[PDB]
């Protein structure tokens, strides 16, 4: 749980929330997926700014699954680790 | 390779670079780890702003390893998926 390890989620210009994707038939059973708080971003003044968007960050992760106990399966899944703020101007 | 899938790395206010952590004795053999481009962040005007820091985003991932071919090991490793911009003010 990074809600206990890293507090970046709350201090980001692109802050996010955590969602428990629970499942007993897969390992890790519980996964913390990040959903962006806003469309816009937190600027300097501390307002939501719609000249940039908070966007999620995906990552492919290996997982084990089981039938329902005699069968197991290694599979790759896509999980959203956090949010970053994208801009049109570079 | 997200250098081929997602181009956020280059459009982030907290842009990052990719590093190939290659290893034949582990699966996935090659891993793309994100190193932040700057300490500060890209503001509206498009300058690096030192009133906020670009910070990496860690995530624990399962991996397989092998001896050097008769032994294997499932282990959890910490990898940096990308960068977000943290601020003192909330």
């Amino acid at each position, epitope marked *: 749980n990074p809600k206990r390890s890293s507090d970046y989620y709350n201090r980001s210009t692109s802050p996010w929330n955590l969602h428990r994707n629970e499942d007993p038939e897969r390992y890790p059973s519980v996964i913390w997926e990040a959903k962006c708080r806003h469309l816009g971003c937190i600027n300097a003044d501390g307002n939501v700014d719609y000249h940039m968007n908070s966007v999620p960050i*995906q990552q492919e992760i290996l997982v084990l699954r089981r039938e329902p106990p005699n069968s197991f399966r290694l599979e790759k899944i896509l999980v959203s680790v956090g949010c970053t703020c994208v801009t049109p*101007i570079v | 390779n997200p250098k081929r899938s997602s181009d956020y790395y280059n459009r982030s206010t907290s842009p990052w670079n990719l590093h190939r952590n290659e290893d034949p004795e582990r699966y996935p053999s090659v891993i793309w780890e994100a190193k932040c481009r700057h300490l500060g962040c890209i503001n509206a005007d498009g300058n690096v702003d030192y009133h906020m820091n670009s910070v990496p985003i860690q995530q624990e991932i399962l991996v397989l390893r092998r001896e050097p071919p008769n032994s294997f090991r499932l282990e959890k490793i910490l990898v940096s998926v990308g960068c977000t911009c943290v601020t003192p003010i909330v």
Partner: antibody
Amino acid sequence: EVQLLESGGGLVQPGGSLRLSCAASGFTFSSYAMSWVRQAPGKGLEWVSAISGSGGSTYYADSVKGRFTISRDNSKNTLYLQMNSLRAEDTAVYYCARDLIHGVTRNWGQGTLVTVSS
Amino acid sequence: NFMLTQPHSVSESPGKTVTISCTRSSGSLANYYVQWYQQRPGSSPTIVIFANNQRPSGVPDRFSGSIDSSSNSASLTISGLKTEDEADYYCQTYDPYSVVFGGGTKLTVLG
């Protein structure tokens, strides 16, 4: 070079249903907001719908809310538009656009003509 | 939903300067990016200006976007007119849930 190719256009009866497709190339499709814009024959441009890069954010013009449904297949580099309960007012050329952020539209498609008639 | 109002038609002789005004009602124009599009007879729209004043590939210094919130209006300008600039110009902006297009302005080159 960025290319947006619509398809699906056709003649449909009112109350009808139709599926526009837009095959994208020249960019990292998975990391871009997409838009569908229309233009009624002889009228101007009119925003229809929007979808985030992830597909977890979905936006709709009042007129098409509850009838049209935007979706994407980031795996196949294609953006879809499922039109149901098509009214005559939905006759137009639907163009497909790539948006930098939500709102800032950067590239446009060739367009596809949808005719809703009895 | 709010609205953008731009003049129906615009005229001028060549080599001159034309301003196409786009005036958004509810919401502050300063908070959201304005874009401009050109539409030639029979052709599909094309990006002219984006993020209030940026020009892409194939857009000369002749075209140039600008903004002014103390009246709440963004303005695309064309310095040094060419007969070949005759087309429909649309402004476009947004808000957290909607995207809005102008009614368009039909440019005309006298002479």
